[PDB]
């Protein structure tokens, strides 16, 4: 970050995250259990 009247370094900062990535970082109903999926346990084993 630069001072605007005279342009000298004043502070360094961490990397940004663009609001799009922030939003798609953590929105989820996120609560169904494996109990609610029936009839394809074999695929679940293959994937995990």
């Amino acid at each position: 970050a630069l001072d605007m009247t005279t342009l000298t370094i004043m502070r360094y900062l961490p990397r940004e995250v663009d609001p799009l990535v922030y939003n798609m970082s953590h929105e989820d109903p996120g609560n169904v259990s494996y109990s609610e999926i029936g009839g394809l346990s074999e695929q679940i084993r293959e994937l995990r």
């Binding site: 001072d3 009247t5 005279t6 000298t8």
Partner: protein, 287 residues
Amino acid sequence: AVDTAEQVYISSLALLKMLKHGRAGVPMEVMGLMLGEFVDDYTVRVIDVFAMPQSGTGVSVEAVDPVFQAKMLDMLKQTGRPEMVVGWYHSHPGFGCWLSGVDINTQQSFEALSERAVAVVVDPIQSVKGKVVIDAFRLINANMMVLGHEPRQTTSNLGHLNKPSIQALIHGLNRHYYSITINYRKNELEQKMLLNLHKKSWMEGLTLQDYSEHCKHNESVVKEMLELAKNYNKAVEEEDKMTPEQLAIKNVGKQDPKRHLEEHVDVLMTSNIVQCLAAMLDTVVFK
């Protein structure tokens, strides 16, 4: 009425401290307080200056402890410095030199408290080894000047030697105040010091450079001469073949071998001469 000629004498120490303090608050208008005496109607002399505890925000600063000032000042007297306050100074980085807005207000109360006050402004970031940028001001009267009265009296050329810059005119120097000329007056003893300030010990002067490594440098430069001689022959051959300035204008990229050839002399010379002389001396002075 104030005479045009009156000087400000600043005492060499104060200047060094003003710089080493200004070039630290790099982007901020650090400020401080300045001590001296009013010798006469044609003089003011500043003898020392000291900093304060202060805080600011880039757009401003001010000092926070009022007690510290009176305590420091009353302490100093115990060691021969009874002088009192005559003014203050603050640094403008890169802007230039002038008083603006708030700086007039804090200034003007000094003049109600003590006539003949002085405000100084220094710029530490444009300055360079040859010259430092300093100015000293005082406020014009609080108008009642529709009378067209001059602010000052004149009975000498002594005040009209200098040309005011465009920048201060933009911010209005002759419209609201006036400049006063800075002058230096070093005493005997400090100037005796100031020349010693670079002397280097006798131990070194008699010392020889290594003879190896030295020979290496000689062979380096001599083998560097070749390419320049080769290029020089062509550069001699081709000139006057075109219009005169179109020599230089077409020689902005590639180098011109004359200068690079010439300035490798003054490296064989100087070096070889001084080494042979120093050896030739000290072969006698020791046994």
